[PDB]
Design a protein around this motif. Structure first.
Motif, PDB file in Angstrom:
ATOM      1  N   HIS A  25       0.822  -1.203   0.000  1.00  0.00           N
ATOM      2  CA  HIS A  25       0.000   0.000   0.000  1.00  0.00           C
ATOM      3  C   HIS A  25       0.859   1.257   0.000  1.00  0.00           C
ATOM      4  O   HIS A  25       0.549   2.227  -0.698  1.00  0.00           O
ATOM      5  CB  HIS A  25      -0.950  -0.015   1.195  1.00  0.00           C
TER       6      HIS A  25
ATOM      7  N   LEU B  42       1.052   4.162  -2.799  1.00  0.00           N
ATOM      8  CA  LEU B  42       0.874   5.569  -2.461  1.00  0.00           C
ATOM      9  C   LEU B  42       2.029   6.420  -2.965  1.00  0.00           C
ATOM     10  O   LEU B  42       1.837   7.596  -3.290  1.00  0.00           O
ATOM     11  CB  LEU B  42       0.712   5.726  -0.949  1.00  0.00           C
TER      12      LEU B  42
ATOM     13  N   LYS C 139      -6.751  19.428  -2.696  1.00  0.00           N
ATOM     14  CA  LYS C 139      -7.920  18.879  -2.018  1.00  0.00           C
ATOM     15  C   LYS C 139      -7.598  17.617  -1.233  1.00  0.00           C
ATOM     16  O   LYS C 139      -8.370  17.240  -0.347  1.00  0.00           O
ATOM     17  CB  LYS C 139      -9.044  18.584  -3.012  1.00  0.00           C
ATOM     18  N   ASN C 140      -6.483  16.959  -1.536  1.00  0.00           N
ATOM     19  CA  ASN C 140      -6.077  15.747  -0.842  1.00  0.00           C
ATOM     20  C   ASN C 140      -5.085  16.016   0.280  1.00  0.00           C
ATOM     21  O   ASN C 140      -4.567  15.065   0.872  1.00  0.00           O
ATOM     22  CB  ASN C 140      -5.489  14.745  -1.834  1.00  0.00           C
ATOM     23  N   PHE C 141      -4.805  17.282   0.579  1.00  0.00           N
ATOM     24  CA  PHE C 141      -3.877  17.610   1.651  1.00  0.00           C
ATOM     25  C   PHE C 141      -4.401  17.110   2.989  1.00  0.00           C
ATOM     26  O   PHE C 141      -5.596  17.198   3.281  1.00  0.00           O
ATOM     27  CB  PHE C 141      -3.648  19.121   1.721  1.00  0.00           C
ATOM     28  N   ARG C 142      -3.494  16.597   3.809  1.00  0.00           N
ATOM     29  CA  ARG C 142      -3.810  16.198   5.168  1.00  0.00           C
ATOM     30  C   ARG C 142      -2.762  16.754   6.116  1.00  0.00           C
ATOM     31  O   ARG C 142      -1.604  16.937   5.729  1.00  0.00           O
ATOM     32  CB  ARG C 142      -3.863  14.671   5.303  1.00  0.00           C
TER      33      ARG C 142
ATOM     34  N   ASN D 163      -7.839   9.301  12.001  1.00  0.00           N
ATOM     35  CA  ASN D 163      -8.496   8.955  10.744  1.00  0.00           C
ATOM     36  C   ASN D 163      -8.278  10.002   9.661  1.00  0.00           C
ATOM     37  O   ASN D 163      -8.776   9.828   8.547  1.00  0.00           O
ATOM     38  CB  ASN D 163     -10.003   8.715  10.913  1.00  0.00           C
TER      39      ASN D 163
ATOM     40  N   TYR E 102     -11.785  22.926  11.753  1.00  0.00           N
ATOM     41  CA  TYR E 102     -12.812  22.178  11.034  1.00  0.00           C
ATOM     42  C   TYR E 102     -12.702  20.688  11.334  1.00  0.00           C
ATOM     43  O   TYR E 102     -13.702  20.028  11.646  1.00  0.00           O
ATOM     44  CB  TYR E 102     -12.712  22.425   9.531  1.00  0.00           C
ATOM     45  N   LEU E 103     -11.487  20.143  11.246  1.00  0.00           N
ATOM     46  CA  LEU E 103     -11.271  18.755  11.632  1.00  0.00           C
ATOM     47  C   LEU E 103     -11.582  18.539  13.103  1.00  0.00           C
ATOM     48  O   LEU E 103     -11.921  17.423  13.510  1.00  0.00           O
ATOM     49  CB  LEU E 103      -9.834  18.338  11.325  1.00  0.00           C
TER      50      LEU E 103
ATOM     51  N   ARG F  31     -16.736  26.065   2.112  1.00  0.00           N
ATOM     52  CA  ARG F  31     -17.709  25.200   2.779  1.00  0.00           C
ATOM     53  C   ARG F  31     -17.336  24.963   4.239  1.00  0.00           C
ATOM     54  O   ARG F  31     -17.392  23.840   4.739  1.00  0.00           O
ATOM     55  CB  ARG F  31     -17.872  23.867   2.046  1.00  0.00           C
TER      56      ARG F  31
ATOM     57  N   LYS G 275     -11.483   9.796   3.826  1.00  0.00           N
ATOM     58  CA  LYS G 275     -11.776  10.878   4.753  1.00  0.00           C
ATOM     59  C   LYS G 275     -10.926  12.104   4.448  1.00  0.00           C
ATOM     60  O   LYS G 275     -10.355  12.730   5.341  1.00  0.00           O
ATOM     61  CB  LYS G 275     -11.591  10.414   6.193  1.00  0.00           C
ATOM     62  N   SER G 276     -10.839  12.440   3.169  1.00  0.00           N
ATOM     63  CA  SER G 276     -10.075  13.598   2.740  1.00  0.00           C
ATOM     64  C   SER G 276     -10.631  14.859   3.391  1.00  0.00           C
ATOM     65  O   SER G 276     -11.851  15.071   3.376  1.00  0.00           O
ATOM     66  CB  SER G 276     -10.124  13.719   1.218  1.00  0.00           C
ATOM     67  N   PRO G 277      -9.785  15.698   3.992  1.00  0.00           N
ATOM     68  CA  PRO G 277     -10.285  16.967   4.540  1.00  0.00           C
ATOM     69  C   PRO G 277     -10.985  17.820   3.502  1.00  0.00           C
ATOM     70  O   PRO G 277     -11.900  18.578   3.844  1.00  0.00           O
ATOM     71  CB  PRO G 277      -9.012  17.649   5.051  1.00  0.00           C
ATOM     72  N   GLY G 278     -10.581  17.711   2.241  1.00  0.00           N
ATOM     73  CA  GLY G 278     -11.150  18.457   1.148  1.00  0.00           C
ATOM     74  C   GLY G 278     -12.407  17.884   0.547  1.00  0.00           C
ATOM     75  O   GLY G 278     -12.834  18.347  -0.512  1.00  0.00           O
ATOM     76  N   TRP G 279     -13.015  16.876   1.177  1.00  0.00           N
ATOM     77  CA  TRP G 279     -14.309  16.391   0.711  1.00  0.00           C
ATOM     78  C   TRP G 279     -15.387  17.446   0.939  1.00  0.00           C
ATOM     79  O   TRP G 279     -16.018  17.915  -0.012  1.00  0.00           O
ATOM     80  CB  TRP G 279     -14.656  15.069   1.400  1.00  0.00           C
ATOM     81  N   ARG G 280     -15.613  17.824   2.199  1.00  0.00           N
ATOM     82  CA  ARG G 280     -16.324  19.034   2.620  1.00  0.00           C
ATOM     83  C   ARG G 280     -17.471  19.478   1.714  1.00  0.00           C
ATOM     84  O   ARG G 280     -17.405  20.573   1.142  1.00  0.00           O
ATOM     85  CB  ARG G 280     -15.327  20.190   2.737  1.00  0.00           C
TER      86      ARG G 280
ATOM     87  N   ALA H 286      -6.968   9.854  -2.347  1.00  0.00           N
ATOM     88  CA  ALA H 286      -7.231   9.989  -0.921  1.00  0.00           C
ATOM     89  C   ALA H 286      -7.403   8.627  -0.265  1.00  0.00           C
ATOM     90  O   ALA H 286      -6.890   8.388   0.834  1.00  0.00           O
ATOM     91  CB  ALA H 286      -8.470  10.854  -0.696  1.00  0.00           C
ATOM     92  N   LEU H 287      -8.118   7.716  -0.929  1.00  0.00           N
ATOM     93  CA  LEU H 287      -8.282   6.376  -0.383  1.00  0.00           C
ATOM     94  C   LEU H 287      -6.967   5.615  -0.378  1.00  0.00           C
ATOM     95  O   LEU H 287      -6.726   4.814   0.527  1.00  0.00           O
ATOM     96  CB  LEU H 287      -9.335   5.601  -1.171  1.00  0.00           C
TER      97      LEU H 287
ATOM     98  N   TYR I 253      -4.029   6.945   0.186  1.00  0.00           N
ATOM     99  CA  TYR I 253      -3.343   7.412   1.386  1.00  0.00           C
ATOM    100  C   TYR I 253      -3.960   6.816   2.644  1.00  0.00           C
ATOM    101  O   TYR I 253      -3.241   6.367   3.545  1.00  0.00           O
ATOM    102  CB  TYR I 253      -3.361   8.937   1.460  1.00  0.00           C
ATOM    103  N   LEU I 254      -5.292   6.817   2.730  1.00  0.00           N
ATOM    104  CA  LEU I 254      -5.955   6.315   3.929  1.00  0.00           C
ATOM    105  C   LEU I 254      -5.674   4.832   4.141  1.00  0.00           C
ATOM    106  O   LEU I 254      -5.445   4.392   5.272  1.00  0.00           O
ATOM    107  CB  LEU I 254      -7.457   6.572   3.843  1.00  0.00           C
ATOM    108  N   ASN I 255      -5.687   4.047   3.062  1.00  0.00           N
ATOM    109  CA  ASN I 255      -5.389   2.625   3.170  1.00  0.00           C
ATOM    110  C   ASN I 255      -3.954   2.393   3.613  1.00  0.00           C
ATOM    111  O   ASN I 255      -3.697   1.545   4.475  1.00  0.00           O
ATOM    112  CB  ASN I 255      -5.646   1.926   1.836  1.00  0.00           C
TER     113      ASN I 255
END
Ligand SMILES: CCCCNc1cc(C(=O)O)cc(S(N)(=O)=O)c1Oc1ccccc1
Ligand SMILES: CCCCNc1cc(C(=O)O)cc(S(N)(=O)=O)c1Oc1ccccc1
Ligand SMILES: [Cl-]
Ligand SMILES: [Cl-]
Ligand SMILES: [K+]
Ligand SMILES: [K+]
Ligand code: NA
Ligand code: NA
Lengths: 876, 876
Positions: free
Chosen positions: A532, A536, A544-547, A573, A705-706, A744, B459-464, B523-524, B526-528
């Motif tokens: 994985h 990645l 938009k994918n920034f964390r 998460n 926000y998070l 948003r 759970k991308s912060p930019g989903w919003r 995003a998925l 990264y999360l995985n």
């Protein structure tokens, strides 16, 4: 000369030898890298232990009783197919068992030990319990078969004790007691009984084969005719003469194919496995299958299906068409298709003992076949149970783990399995329970095949089977076929056994026993994580994918629990949390300290349900350890991008080297393009106020926000404070509203402050000056010797030029703290922009005093400075 | 009075502004972190552009023609059930579309833009092509419906041009030409046409409702009776008077529920989406569903199923029972069950035009219903096509992306969709085609719902999303229901559409277009990766789960390609590979260099199928950057344990500081429990010989086994060399054989050498001394100034005391090289133990000369020193 001595005698380095890799069963106690680098009673062979035992366990009550009924209800070809399907299942299962067996030394137990050491204690415990129970029940079922043939032979003569069922129970109890006696007497006696039963059974098989080659006119009224091609062409064909089908015949036959693991269940008493189990089990399977096929064909090509037991049948050869194959040989045993005629290959289960020679020899073969399998299962069950109980998977059964005698013999397990078998024998009507036991055996076989497939899927270097011919796809196919055959036989029994497996799996994984066996599950976990991460690494970054990937300088993750909880709040998460700990001191002691702390703190993090990584490093001080972590921590695209620091509460009473190093951590983080988050909260102990006064890309807006996106802060509403000008409050308020509506970001209110850039109160400036006092350089009141102070007692000493050139920023900090006290005094948490001090222009003490003055006497407050790279977007 | 000015005017730090986040639509932009730190033409509203378009697209041919037939075949209750099921599907799809469309600014396109920007270009391109083709066919479908009603109304009179199937094509071509003309005219003209069609259709609906409250005796012979409760109680229940079932009726009804994305395919012309699409689409769905339900109930409780139209049907209270809902009102429309009567709810499709008043008004309603939907599809298809073509996902269709006029209007796409519709109209028999188009629409809806579910699972912060009421489980349920409904109608059409989607997805993912939209797929990913790493962090280490986790000091990973391939050979799919690069120089330039090299070299690694990580660091020299990497690189339990270095081939013609740094890298790796692997091969460019003479725990044995695992070295056989004693060769060979048989390591032969420890040749010792001489301290021939020489030109200077204290080790290295030359000269690769020089006792130059003498003039050779922790095991 000494030039021809033992290599490795003139050095401290040791040559490779088996004594370095042997746990307990020494020499030279292989030198550690530091020492070289630092500056100055019963054992069985594969024949008697595996081959014979599997041979006897496979051959049970069917080879001599019900096999002819199978060749009757289904054709010779269909019977051969039925045999070969179960043979394929057992052959794949044996190949998988061999592959597991040749991976290392197997202490004791059988399929349980293999499964538990292959893929862990959850499936291991489930299959151990289920297979032990299945063998315990199979003991009762083989004993019931013995009782049935005994009462049948008694009813043939003039003898009967009570009703047939009651007599069955009475005789079965006696035989189970006797079998318990032989099992208790020891393994050598069990082996002697096994070999005598083997020779008796082989004699019975030879008796049958010789009988079919010598036809007699006395058995001519019977189906016996002596290999007539008419019978061959007549019996080749699926004549199902009752409410029976192909699948039901397969369900009846499958229990005969079981018993392949009798030899592997003895592994605790084998001279050596990894050589005994593979060849013994494969030879046993091959021989049993060949005998089954040959005997089925012979009895199908020699006995007709229907037959009438009377010499009154004639061979006059009168006018009759007789399209059937019975007449072609003679008129005997013909035309009983109108009423149920007595016997034949469809109505007689004694035909095996008929077409043979000496019939009591065949009866003795029946007894040996049904008693050897019962003895094998009665030995098998307590060995597995004791092996599983020694691991303490279920603490309630710890009592049954004890052994007695020179060879560890589970006498308590013997008593328990005897009691279970006796209980199931008194019922004496087990045809309802038989599919469940067959499904239990099938589940065990399926999980063995899945064990091999799973160990081959994970690519552990320690898999290394010595046995070849174990293809992973063949084992996966075998597991699939085992499940399919499980469902074919009594669908609801298959569903029930799946339910038991799942329930035991969940119970074990909840109990979480403290065992580490290097299972394929852990190897597969590592392989999945690596794959994985590699996937990645090929993913391009996007806004938009920034964390928030945060590196927290928490030291020990126990010192500040509330701070670490808060950081977890906006990381769990979403993004990555790395807890950074820097260890100092002598290298040798520090390595051991880090090794202990890694385990202890990772365990503490897991126990307290935190999704954080522990990253300890060794360095001469906090600053360079943080440099290590900020330069190298992470893997691929999972590297941190933000530094999270707890506020230095004791900086007023502390050495200024420490606070200088704190501020230098700030500066280094800004140097390598990291965001910085400073958290100041009371460690002893609904709105989220966000004072977004400077644009850093949006990190100071993204964090709260998070925060609100979690259940802990779900009841808190974000309200925003921004800087503006008087007489233009509404315009700037609307601009902010539209800006964060495009983001948003839900907010409850927007407050525009026009009182910034106004001089703070006199008392507050006096207090700040008093706090600053003991760190001023006072170069104005000193001679040129102050330059020496600027190089020795500094660069944390505060000069006068910077205290006059940055008075605006100092006043802004003090006034901002006044505003926070006036407005956000009753907030759950405050997020505020963190001021950036230009490196080389602001001393450490002035920076720290700015942060102190701005953050003092407030509820939990976060000072945030983003990377000034865009973190939010309103584009799709 | 300047205290009351604009906040942020007396500082370099900016305040949050909209201009800092705007792509192209200024100011002074957002100041960089370095700058603060480094030392010194047609737009529609939601009513007209979304709501009207969606209402017009949904209402098509069936609302006024076949709805009565559905209410006749199925019951009133089952008709409402069918309507509500399709409404549930479309409502979940609308909620999903709203959630997707309230995230960011949607440039143009329609559902294609949403899908591609939510979960990437593969699904995006597939559904874009499928939805564009489906709308292109739907144009022909609605035009064929219009042609059919035109030909029916012509055949009602005496007018007829050609045969019906040919007159249909003749009229349909004309209508499609006029539709192309009005579409090409422009958006405003199309909007006006849509508004007039809306008003005409609403007038027709009002006509039907007004005429149903007016029972006239002229229509009494037909089914028209005027809301009699007997009809209500009689039209319940599923009376299917044909080879029609409930599922077939639902399949007929479903195409009437589509067209919900007409207002979302116009997104490129809306005043602002994120506010128009949600409310407009949801309100349109609600209104259309309410009208469908009301019309169904009204026509069901008003008209009887069968009706023999004849004035002779009278009710004079004749002597009969007739327990049916026909005579309860009158004798009209009675007893036409023996032979099919002329019309009614089951035999008439014009019953809508009969129940109403003015009949040509209902005919105009038919015309508007068909033409508005055809126009909507004809507009939506080229918009989607040109949005898909602007991304160049399929480079073969690049010509269809260009637009004409002020607003970018895909005229070429208009001609393409006109041609496709014209081609399908000429066939004029699309009832076979219909399930395919319905399945295409269903697949589009399903992937919209799956887009929402995917964006919520990641759970991308930019989903919003700005739109609430979008529960992800409801979206998953909607996707599942869309697939189920796709399967219900024409299973093989569903298989075919799955095949097309799968093939298009594979083609796109193979083409790999150069786009980066921040999709939920990344995003998925990264999360995985994060979740799997967190799971791995809780896994206890075990000896048989050990893997080589190698940090290779490649520098630029393309500098030594053969070395990189060799390290990949024993790392690919087993363990972790980290390529470490140390960057020097000024920090500002080095950060940019690292940023460029990270992308360049990660792309190079990916493009050559290398499963390696690039780990650049900034440091003053190689040694401290390597210290950074050895201390911090890796995440959790995925940290390196071995250091891999290439042989310093130029060490003779190089500054001794560099070679001293190299040897210190050796020592630092040994300091923190790291294995070391040295690789020396010719970069210019069948057995594997393992000379493992010292027990390092087994790394020297484990690496060549992993080499033999790969298919590149699958034809090479491992043969082992160990050190032993003369006159004890066989015993030591047998001990080695049993030791590595317990390890399950396949070997071809074992060779035991007794010639080690013997003096090497005179010439070789002379050559070693000649190489050594330039770096000798020669303290015996000098004075106490050598102590200062041993501090400046040092510690790489070689002393006489160590040259005498380790002469045996030097001779061992030279002799071992002689043995390698005479024995392993023809090997494909050689693996040998790496000597360990004690730190503080052997100079750097002596260690480097030892390695050089050992490995000189040989095939590719690996020098391996393990951790001296156990790496192999023979326990299961
Ligand atoms: C799980 C298998 C344990 C033994 N049971 C089994 C064994 C054999 C055999 O050949 O080893 C044949 C049969 S069977 N279908 O009856 O011919 C057996 O079924 C029984 C036996 C007795 C009571 C109820 C079911
Ligand atoms: C995918 C939907 C495209 C339009 N087709 C569709 C529309 C409607 C409606 O109400 O909008 C009703 C029907 S229907 N009563 O099932 O025939 C339709 O099926 C047709 C129409 C004409 C030719 C062949 C099939
Ligand atoms: Cl078994
Ligand atoms: Cl649509
Ligand atoms: K058996
Ligand atoms: K429609
Ligand atoms: Na037996
Ligand atoms: Na329409």
């Amino acid at each position: 000369t000494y030039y021809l001595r033992t290599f490795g005698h003139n050095t401290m380095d040791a040559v490779p030898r088996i004594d370095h890799y042997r746990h307990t069963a020494e020499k030279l106690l292989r030198p550690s890298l530091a020492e070289l680098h630092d500056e100055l009673v019963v054992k069985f062979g594969w024949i008697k232990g595996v081959l014979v035992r599997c041979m006897l366990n496979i051959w049970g009550v069917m080879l001599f009783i019900r096999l002819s009924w199978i060749v009757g209800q289904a054709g010779i070809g269909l019977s051969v197919l039925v045999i070969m399907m179960a043979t394929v299942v057992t052959t794949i299962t044996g190949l998988s068992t061999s592959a597991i067996a040749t991976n290392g030394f197997v202490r004791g137990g059988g399929a349980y030990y293999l499964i538990s050491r292959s893929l862990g204690p959850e499936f291991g415990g489930a299959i151990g319990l289920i297979f032990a129970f299945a063998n315990a029940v199979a003991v009762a079922m083989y004993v019931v078969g013995f009782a049935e043939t005994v009462v049948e032979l008694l009813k043939e003569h003039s003898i009967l004790m009570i009703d047939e069922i009651n007599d069955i129970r009475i005789i079965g109890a006696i035989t189970v007691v006797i079998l318990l006696g032989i099992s208790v007497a020891g393994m050598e006696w069990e082996a002697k009984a096994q070999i005598v039963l083997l020779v008796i059974l082989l004699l019975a098989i030879g008796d049958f084969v010789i009988g079919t080659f010598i036809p007699l006119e006395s058995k001519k009224p019977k189906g016996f005719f002596g290999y007539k091609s008419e019978i061959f062409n007549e019996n080749f064909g699926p004549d199902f003469r009752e409410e029976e089908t192909f699948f039901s015949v397969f369900a009846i036959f499958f229990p005969a194919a079981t018993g392949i693991l009798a030899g592997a269940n003895i592994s605790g008493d084998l001279a050596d496995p990894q050589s005994a189990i593979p060849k013994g089990t494969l030879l046993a399977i091959l021989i049993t299958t060949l005998v089954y096929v040959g005997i089925a064909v012979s009895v199908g090509s020699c006995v007709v299906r229907d037959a009438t037991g009377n010499v009154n049948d004639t061979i006059v050869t009168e006018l009759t068409n007789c399209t059937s194959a019975a007449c072609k040989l003679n008129f005997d045993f013909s035309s009983c298709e109108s009423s149920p005629c007595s016997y034949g290959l469809m109505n007689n289960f004694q035909v095996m003992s008929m077409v043979s020679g000496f019939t009591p020899l065949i009866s003795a073969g029946i007894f040996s076949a049904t008693l050897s399998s019962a003895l094998a299962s009665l030995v098998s069950a307590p060995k597995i149970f004791q092996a599983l109980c020694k691991d303490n998977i279920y603490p309630a059964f710890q009592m049954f783990a004890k052994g007695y005698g020179k060879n560890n013999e589970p006498l308590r397990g013997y008593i328990l399995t005897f009691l279970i078998a006796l209980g199931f024998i008194l019922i004496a009507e087990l045809n309802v329970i038989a599919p469940i036991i067959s499904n239990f055996f099938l589940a065990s076989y399926a999980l063995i095949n899945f064990s091999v497939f799973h160990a081959s899927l994970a690519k552990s270097p320690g898999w290394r089977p010595a046995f070849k011919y174990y293809n992973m796809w063949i084992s996966l196919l075998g597991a699939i076929l085992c499940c399919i055959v499980m469902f074919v036989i009594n669908w609801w029994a298959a569903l029930l056994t799946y339910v038991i497996v799942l329930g035991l799996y969940i119970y074990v994984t909840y109990k979480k026993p403290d065992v580490n066996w290097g299972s394929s599950t852990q190897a597969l976990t590592y392989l999945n994580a690596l794959q994985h991460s590699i996937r990645l690494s090929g993913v391009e970054d996007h806004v938009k994918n920034f964390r928030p990937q945060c590196l927290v300088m928490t030291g020990a993750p126990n010192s500040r629990p509330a701070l670490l909880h808060l950081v977890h709040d906006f990381t769990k998460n979403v993004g990555l949390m790395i807890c950074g700990h820097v260890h100092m001191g002598p290298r040798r002691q520090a390595m051991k300290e880090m090794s202990i702390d890694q385990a202890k703190y990772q365990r503490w993090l897991i126990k307290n349900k935190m999704k954080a990584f522990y990253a300890p490093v060794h360095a001469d001080d906090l600053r360079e350890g943080a440099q290590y972590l900020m330069q190298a921590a992470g893997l691929g695209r999972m590297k941190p991008n933000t530094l999270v620091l707890g506020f230095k509460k004791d900086w007023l009473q502390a050495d200024m080297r420490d606070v200088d190093m704190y501020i230098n951590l700030f500066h280094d983080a800004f140097d390598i393009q990291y965001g910085v988050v400073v958290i100041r909260l009371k460690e002893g102990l609904n709105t989220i106020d966000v004072w977004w006064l400077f644009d850093d890309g949006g990190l100071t807006l993204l964090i709260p926000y998070l925060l609100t996106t979690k259940k802990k802060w779900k009841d808190c509403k974000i309200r925003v404070f921004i800087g503006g000008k008087i007489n233009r409050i509404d315009h700037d308020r609307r601009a902010m509203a539209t800006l964060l509506s495009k983001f948003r970001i839900d907010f409850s209110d927007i407050m525009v402050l026009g009182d910034i850039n106004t001089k703070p109160k006199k008392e507050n400036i006096i207090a700040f000056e008093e706090i600053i006092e003991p760190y001023r350089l006072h170069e104005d009141d000193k001679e040129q010797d102050i330059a020496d102070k600027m190089k020795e007692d500094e660069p944390w000493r505060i000069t006068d030029n910077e205290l006059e050139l940055y008075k605006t920023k100092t006043y802004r900090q003090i006034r901002l703290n006044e505003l926070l006290k006036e407005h956000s005094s009753t907030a759950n948490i405050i997020v505020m922009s963190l001021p950036v001090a230009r490196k080389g222009a602001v001393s450490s003490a002035l920076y720290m005093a700015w942060l102190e003055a701005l953050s003092k006497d407030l509820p939990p407050i976060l000072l945030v400075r983003g990377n000034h790279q865009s973190v939010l977007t309103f584009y799709s």
